[PDB]
Structure 1
Amino acid sequence: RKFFVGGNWKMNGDKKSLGELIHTLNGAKLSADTEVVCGAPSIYLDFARQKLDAKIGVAAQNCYKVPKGAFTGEISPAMIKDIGAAWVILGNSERRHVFGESDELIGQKVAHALAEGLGVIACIGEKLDEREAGITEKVVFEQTKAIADNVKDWSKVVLAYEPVWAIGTGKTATPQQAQEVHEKLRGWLKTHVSDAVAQSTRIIYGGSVTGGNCKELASQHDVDGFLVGGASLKPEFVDIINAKH
């Protein structure tokens, strides 16, 4: 399984500061064994795809579930592919908990981005109260089944486990906490889809990944890479891409 790291820039940047970040990544020595994709703000997607070297993919941070229509504020898979981006991040913690997107809506968005030929980074994760109630497994298998029910071809899907308590807080899951869930998730895929999909699907971890802690997390057997937020805007993003070296 090729190591994967996505950088989600969230609502940050302008052309000058993102042009500078893109020049850094294009000049840097990035492992050819890592699949790198950057998720730009929708207003900067075209600029990003035109600037970035072709080996680095571009991801939209969100999309809607139909090609066109009266949905002011939304963009569709058709528009993302038009600009040349090849991925979309769906079901992220902020979309679910700050903007209230449901499992059913994230599921409809996944089926439609895949039909439209886009790759999907699909995010799952439990809240602090759920982790402490000991229902982490129940919660993430429920979100994963919502996504799975909408995936015909798993070869363009990357699952991202991002515990909500670990996003932007600085409280990173320990290597053993991230491994335990990745391994349970991969068994869920083995018994509910097939062993072939369990073995080939990348399951990445997100939630306060930094240059300083990425190598020990990357050493866990079922951690296939990372979804990186705040540190995707800093030069240390180059070290996270290179975590296995």
Structure 2
Amino acid sequence: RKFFVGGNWKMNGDKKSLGELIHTLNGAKLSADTEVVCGAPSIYLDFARQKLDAKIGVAAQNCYKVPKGAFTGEISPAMIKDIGAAWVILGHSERRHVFGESDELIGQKVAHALAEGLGVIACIGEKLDEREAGITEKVVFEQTKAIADNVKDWSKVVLAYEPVWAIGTGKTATPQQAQEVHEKLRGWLKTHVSDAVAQSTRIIYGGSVTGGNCKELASQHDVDGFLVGGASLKPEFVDIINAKH
């Protein structure tokens, strides 16, 4: 499995500061063995794709489930491809809990984006109350099933495990808690999809990854890379890309 590092810029940046960041990435020495993707605000997707070196992919932070129509404020996979972006982040924790997107809706989005030829970073993760209650497993397996049910070809899918309690809080999961879930998710895939799918699908970790953290997390056997928020807007993003080196 090729190590994968995605940067989710969330709702940050302007052309000046994003221009700066992109110039930094373009001139940096990034490991040839890492697949890098930058998820930019929709208003700057075109901008980002035009300025980033070709080896770095671009991802949209969200999309809707049909190519066109009466959906004021939404964008579709066809528009994302039009711009030259190759991926979309779906099921993000903020979409789920702040914007109320349901599992059913996320599933429809995944099916459509894949049908349209885009790669998908699909996010799953339990809340603090769920972890404390000890139902982390039931929660993620249920979210995964919603995604799986809509995946025909797993070759363009990356699963991102991001515990809600770890997102933007500074409370990173320990390497052992990340490994435990990744291992269980990989087993879910093996029993419910197939051995081949489980072996080739990248399962990445997200939730307060820093230049400081990454090396120990990246050494876990079932951790295939990371989905980075806050640190993707800093110079230390380079260190994260290079975690396995």
User: In the aligned structure 1, how far is the partner of 2:213 from the partner of 2:119?
Assistant: 28
Per the TM alignment, residue 110 of structure 1 is displaced from its structure 2 partner at its CA by: 0.1
User: In the aligned structure 2, how far is the partner of 1:151 from the partner of 1:125?
Assistant: 19
Per the TM alignment, residue 31 of structure 1 is displaced from its structure 2 partner at its CA by: 0.1
2:129 maps to 129
Secondary structure in structure 2 of the residue aligned to 1:89 = strand
User: In the aligned structure 2, how far is the partner of 1:74 from the partner of 1:161?
Assistant: 25
Per the TM alignment, residue 194 of structure 1 is displaced from its structure 2 partner at its CA by: 0.2
Per the TM alignment, residue 159 of structure 1 is displaced from its structure 2 partner at its CA by: 0.1
Structure 1 residue runs of 4+, over 3 Å off?
A: none
Secondary structure in structure 2 of the residue aligned to 1:203 = strand
Post-superposition CA distance 1:172-222 (Å, at most 9, x none): 000000000000000000000000000000000000000000000000000
Per the TM alignment, residue 41 of structure 1 is displaced from its structure 2 partner at its CA by: 0.1
Secondary structure in structure 2 of the residue aligned to 1:5 = strand
User: In the aligned structure 2, how far is the partner of 1:171 from the partner of 1:226?
Assistant: 15
Q: RMSD across aligned C-alpha pairs, in angstroms?
A: 0.1
Per the TM alignment, residue 42 of structure 1 is displaced from its structure 2 partner at its CA by: 0.0
User: In the aligned structure 2, how far is the partner of 1:59 from the partner of 1:161?
Assistant: 17
2:16 maps to 16
Indicate yes or no: 2:27 matched with 1:35: no
Secondary structure in structure 1 of the residue aligned to 2:183 = helix
User: In the aligned structure 2, how far is the partner of 1:72 from the partner of 1:29?
Assistant: 41
Per the TM alignment, residue 81 of structure 1 is displaced from its structure 2 partner at its CA by: 0.1
User: In the aligned structure 1, how far is the partner of 2:37 from the partner of 2:112?
Assistant: 20
Per the TM alignment, residue 230 of structure 1 is displaced from its structure 2 partner at its CA by: 0.2
User: In the aligned structure 2, how far is the partner of 1:32 from the partner of 1:213?
Assistant: 21
User: In the aligned structure 1, how far is the partner of 2:129 from the partner of 2:213?
Assistant: 25
Secondary structure in structure 1 of the residue aligned to 2:110 = helix
Per the TM alignment, residue 127 of structure 1 is displaced from its structure 2 partner at its CA by: 0.1
Per the TM alignment, residue 61 of structure 1 is displaced from its structure 2 partner at its CA by: 0.1
User: How many positions carry a matched residue from both structures?
Assistant: 245
User: In the aligned structure 2, how far is the partner of 1:229 from the partner of 1:238?
Assistant: 13
User: In the aligned structure 2, how far is the partner of 1:213 from the partner of 1:86?
Assistant: 28
2:119 maps to 119
Per the TM alignment, residue 37 of structure 1 is displaced from its structure 2 partner at its CA by: 0.3
Per the TM alignment, residue 164 of structure 1 is displaced from its structure 2 partner at its CA by: 0.1
User: In the aligned structure 1, how far is the partner of 2:211 from the partner of 2:110?
Assistant: 31
Secondary structure in structure 1 of the residue aligned to 2:152 = coil
Per the TM alignment, residue 113 of structure 1 is displaced from its structure 2 partner at its CA by: 0.1
- Identity of matched residues, %: 100
* TM-score normalised over the length of structure 1: 1.00
Indicate yes or no: 2:205 matched with 1:209: no
Secondary structure in structure 1 of the residue aligned to 2:38 = strand
Per the TM alignment, residue 36 of structure 1 is displaced from its structure 2 partner at its CA by: 0.1
User: In the aligned structure 2, how far is the partner of 1:121 from the partner of 1:72?
Assistant: 24
User: In the aligned structure 1, how far is the partner of 2:232 from the partner of 2:202?
Assistant: 20
Post-superposition CA distance 1:48-93 (Å, at most 9, x none): 0000000000000000000000000000000000000000000000
Per the TM alignment, residue 7 of structure 1 is displaced from its structure 2 partner at its CA by: 0.1
1:166 maps to 166
User: In the aligned structure 2, how far is the partner of 1:158 from the partner of 1:50?
Assistant: 24
Post-superposition CA distance 1:2-24 (Å, at most 9, x none): 00000000000000000000000
Secondary structure in structure 2 of the residue aligned to 1:37 = strand
User: In the aligned structure 1, how far is the partner of 2:89 from the partner of 2:5?
Assistant: 12
